[PDB]
């Protein structure tokens, strides 16, 4: 096969000949160039003025191979910078690719799915432009099968991916009714048994849940929460990561929505998520915990009965800083909504020492966060007449020095909190 390594000017020559075959051959040369690992000459291809020509080949139904080669060619240009994508879009590729969705040749519509995927992936505008040109109907149609197993592995992977991009980006979020239209198929995909369909399904859902409550509610209302929780316990990190994000998003919404996650059994996975070797899982799991401890006392209670407080204490005691920061918050949140008993309980789990050690971190934000929390804790200890035994505690682990040296920390609300705390509990 000597359509290998052509020069651009050669590709041009051919595509301009009035010879459908010569053109087919050159377009394949074009694809091959663009498929190379080391810096495919996308720019010069664009610069050569080729995009419109490829675009018009998409429409050549007699000559399927050219349809495919040009499809692939544009697919690859469309995968580069935004500007590269913009060039594909400016050529009129979008309705052309949509038309190809119904091509009788699977390998061709797959290419069309792929390209629409890249275009929608550029960002919200292209995404909604794909949507306006009516891509969503024909995509869904290819998934209109009694059993998803009967479709080819990488064909379904591509559709799942493209679909996820139609759910991706946020300013603005995708159109509500486009989401309504996608959801049922997404749900059906969230249940399929390919690790890769599951990862992308999870992302799709994670994107759609990253907004205001009404959005979360669309999702939660299709009852995917049980199924998200299950996935949360998967062995494949490519699946845990996006599932955990979905759940993390959902618990930012109403307490009602939060409770769906609790009922689903979510909390049971946390012992292991809060100890996970992958740094980011831990950060994200901890964050999620912070949004649960931000809920009602009976929700705080469920965190307690799953024995997650030790896990928080653990995370406060040793994790990379960014996780410890979330633990800090999770605790403050806890100490805000919590009952007296519950705040007591936290201290009996040994929350005071590891909290104190963090006061010497040089991150201004977290210190406030911790001090609000100490504040909060003394408050429950006042209601019990125990501000003493607690002060003593904070002394014996060197917390007292750390706060008492903190009136001379620059920040305003900082030195006032410490000031207050010192005055109020320490003389």
């Amino acid at each position: 096969q000597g359509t290998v390594n052509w020069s651009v000017e050669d590709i041009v020559k051919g595509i301009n000949s009035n010879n459908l075959e010569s053109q087919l051959q050159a377009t394949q040369a074009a694809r091959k160039l663009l498929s190379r690992e080391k810096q495919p000459p996308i720019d010069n291809i664009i610069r050569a003025g080729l995009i419109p020509k490829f675009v018009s080949f998409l429409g050549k139904t007699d000559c399927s191979p050219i349809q495919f080669e040009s499809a692939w060619a544009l697919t690859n240009i469309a995968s580069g910078t935004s500007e590269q994508t913009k060039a594909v879009v400016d050529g009129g590729a979008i309705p052309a690719f949509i038309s190809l969705l119904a091509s009788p040749h699977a390998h061709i519509s797959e290419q069309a799915v792929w390209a629409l995927g890249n275009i929608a992936g550029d960002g919200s505008a292209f995404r909604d432009l794909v949507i306006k040109h009516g891509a969503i109907d024909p995509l869904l149609a290819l998934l209109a099968v009694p059993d998803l197993s009967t479709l080819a592995c990488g064909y379904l992977r591509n559709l799942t991916w493209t679909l996820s991009n139609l759910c991706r980006n946020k300013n603005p979020a995708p159109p509500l009714d486009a989401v309504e239209q996608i959801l049922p198929t997404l749900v059906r995909l969230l249940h399929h048994n390919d690790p890769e369909v599951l990862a992308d399904s999870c992302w799709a859902i994670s994107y759609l849940t990253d907004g205001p409550n009404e959005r979360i509610e669309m999702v939660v209302k299709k009852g995917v929460v049980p199924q998200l929780v299950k996935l949360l316990g998967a062995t494949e990190l490519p699946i845990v990561t996006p599932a955990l994000r979905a759940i993390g998003n959902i618990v930012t919404g109403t307490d009602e929505q939060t409770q769906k996650v609790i009922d689903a059994g979510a909390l049971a996975v946390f012992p292991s998520l809060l100890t996970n070797p992958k740094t980011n899982i831990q950060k994200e799991a901890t964050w999620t915990m912070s949004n649960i401890t931000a809920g009602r006392q009976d929700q705080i209670q469920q965190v307690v009965n799953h024995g997650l407080v030790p896990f928080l204490v653990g995370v406060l005691s040793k994790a990379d800083f960014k996780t410890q920061k979330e633990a800090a918050w999770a605790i403050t949140n806890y100490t805000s909504g919590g009952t007296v008993e519950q705040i007591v309980y936290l201290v009996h789990c040994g929350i005071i020492e590891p909290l104190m050690n963090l006061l010497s971190a040089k991150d201004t934000k977290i210190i406030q966060v911790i001090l609000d929390a100490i504040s909060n804790i003394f408050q429950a200890a006042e209601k019990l007449g125990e501000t003493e035994k607690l002060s003593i505690m904070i002394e014996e682990c060197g917390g007292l020095d750390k706060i008492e040296a903190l009136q001379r920390h620059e920040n305003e609300s900082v030195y006032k909190a410490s000031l207050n705390l010192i005055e109020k509990y320490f003389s």
């Binding site: 498929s35 690859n76 995968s79 992308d200």
Partner: peptide, 7 residues
Amino acid sequence: YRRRRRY
């Protein structure tokens, strides 16, 4: 995962 190139 934004965008994908082929082969």
